[PDB]
Coordinates of C-alpha atoms in Angstrom, one line a residue:
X1 CA 7.7 -9.3 5.3
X2 CA 5.1 -10.4 3.2
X3 CA 3.2 -13.7 4.2
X4 CA 3.6 -16.2 2.1
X5 CA 0.1 -16.7 2.3
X6 CA 0.0 -13.4 -0.1
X7 CA 1.1 -13.0 -3.5
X8 CA 2.9 -9.8 -3.5
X9 CA -0.3 -7.9 -5.2
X10 CA -2.4 -8.8 -2.8
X11 CA -0.3 -7.7 0.4
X12 CA -0.1 -4.8 -1.7
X13 CA -4.4 -4.4 -1.5
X14 CA -4.8 -5.0 2.3
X15 CA -1.8 -2.6 3.2
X16 CA -2.1 -0.2 0.2
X17 CA -5.6 -0.6 -0.8
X18 CA -8.8 1.3 1.5
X19 CA -12.2 0.8 0.4
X20 CA -13.3 2.5 3.6
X21 CA -11.9 5.7 5.1
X22 CA -8.9 4.2 7.3
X23 CA -8.1 4.9 11.2
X24 CA -4.9 3.9 11.2
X25 CA -4.9 2.4 15.2
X26 CA -7.8 0.2 13.6
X27 CA -6.8 -0.2 9.7
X28 CA -3.2 -0.8 10.5
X29 CA -4.6 -4.6 13.3
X30 CA -4.9 -6.4 10.6
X31 CA -1.5 -5.6 9.3
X32 CA 0.6 -5.8 12.1
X33 CA -0.3 -9.3 13.4
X34 CA 1.3 -10.5 10.8
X35 CA 4.0 -8.6 12.2
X36 CA 6.4 -8.9 15.3
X37 CA 7.1 -5.4 16.0
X38 CA 4.8 -2.5 14.5
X39 CA 4.5 -1.2 11.0
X40 CA 6.2 2.5 11.8
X41 CA 5.2 3.9 9.0
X42 CA 1.8 3.6 6.4
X43 CA -0.1 4.5 3.7
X44 CA -3.4 3.7 2.7
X45 CA -4.6 4.9 -1.1
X46 CA -8.6 5.8 -0.3
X47 CA -9.1 4.9 -3.8
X48 CA -11.4 2.6 -6.0
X49 CA -9.2 -1.1 -6.6
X50 CA -9.8 -0.7 -10.4
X51 CA -8.8 3.3 -10.0
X52 CA -4.8 1.7 -7.7
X53 CA -4.8 -0.8 -10.3
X54 CA -5.0 1.7 -13.6
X55 CA -1.7 3.5 -12.0
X56 CA 0.3 0.5 -13.6
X57 CA -0.7 2.7 -17.6
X58 CA 0.2 5.6 -16.2
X59 CA 3.5 8.0 -15.7
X60 CA 6.8 5.2 -16.1
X61 CA 9.7 6.3 -13.7
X62 CA 12.6 4.8 -11.9
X63 CA 12.0 3.1 -8.9
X64 CA 13.0 4.2 -5.2
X65 CA 15.3 0.4 -5.7
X66 CA 16.0 1.5 -8.7
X67 CA 14.0 -1.1 -10.9
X68 CA 12.4 0.0 -13.4
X69 CA 8.6 -1.1 -13.4
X70 CA 7.4 1.7 -11.1
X71 CA 4.5 4.1 -12.3
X72 CA 3.4 7.7 -11.3
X73 CA -0.2 8.3 -11.1
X74 CA -1.8 10.9 -13.6
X75 CA -3.6 13.0 -10.8
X76 CA -3.4 13.3 -7.0
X77 CA -5.1 10.3 -5.5
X78 CA -6.1 10.6 -1.9
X79 CA -4.3 9.1 0.9
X80 CA -4.0 8.6 4.4
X81 CA 0.0 8.3 5.8
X82 CA 0.3 6.1 9.4
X83 CA 3.0 7.1 11.6
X84 CA 3.8 4.8 14.8
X85 CA 3.0 7.0 18.2
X86 CA 6.2 7.6 20.2
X87 CA 5.1 5.2 22.6
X88 CA 3.7 2.9 20.4
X89 CA 4.9 -0.5 22.5
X90 CA 5.0 -4.1 19.9
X91 CA 2.1 -5.8 20.0
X92 CA -0.1 -2.4 21.3
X93 CA 0.8 -0.3 18.0
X94 CA -1.1 3.1 18.0
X95 CA -0.9 5.6 15.0
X96 CA -1.3 9.1 14.3
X97 CA -3.2 9.5 10.9
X98 CA -2.1 12.1 8.5
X99 CA -4.6 12.3 6.0
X100 CA -3.8 14.3 2.5
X101 CA -4.6 13.6 -1.6
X102 CA -1.1 13.6 -3.4
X103 CA 0.0 11.7 -6.4
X104 CA 1.7 8.3 -6.0
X105 CA 4.4 5.9 -7.1
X106 CA 3.4 1.9 -7.5
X107 CA 5.9 -0.8 -8.7
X108 CA 3.9 -2.8 -10.9
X109 CA 4.5 -6.3 -12.2
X110 CA 2.6 -9.5 -13.7
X111 CA -0.1 -11.2 -12.1
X112 CA 1.0 -14.7 -10.3
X113 CA -1.1 -17.2 -10.6
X114 CA -2.6 -17.2 -7.6
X115 CA -4.3 -12.7 -8.5
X116 CA -7.5 -12.8 -10.4
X117 CA -6.9 -13.6 -13.7
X118 CA -9.4 -10.5 -14.2
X119 CA -6.2 -7.7 -13.7
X120 CA -3.1 -9.4 -15.9
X121 CA -0.6 -7.0 -14.8
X122 CA -1.1 -5.0 -11.4
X123 CA 0.7 -3.0 -7.9
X124 CA 2.9 -5.1 -5.8
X125 CA 4.8 -2.7 -4.3
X126 CA 4.2 1.3 -2.6
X127 CA 7.1 3.3 -3.6
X128 CA 6.4 6.5 -2.7
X129 CA 3.3 8.8 -1.2
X130 CA 4.4 12.1 -3.6

């Protein structure tokens, strides 16, 4: 679940934007610290923050949940898919790291008041890795 201390945009960035190349088992720890079971699957976008934010102005598409506020990246982006190993037992979560470069789809919305006023419309959910 989203920890209440983070806005939707903040949690999206924590889970899905990687400045440095992600090694899944290391990078997932900050996420699973807020959880009570290992996150089974998680995608990181390894691109500058502004490039990920800018997907919110690209190709508008229907979201998997039926909402209309999703967008598909114009270009393939560098991503890393993290999948929990079959032997992992919470709280010790290990991941397989599957890098790639694909179009992404994100949901976007107006910023929360607790989000930076410099980005009025921001990504809040990772919808798809293709």
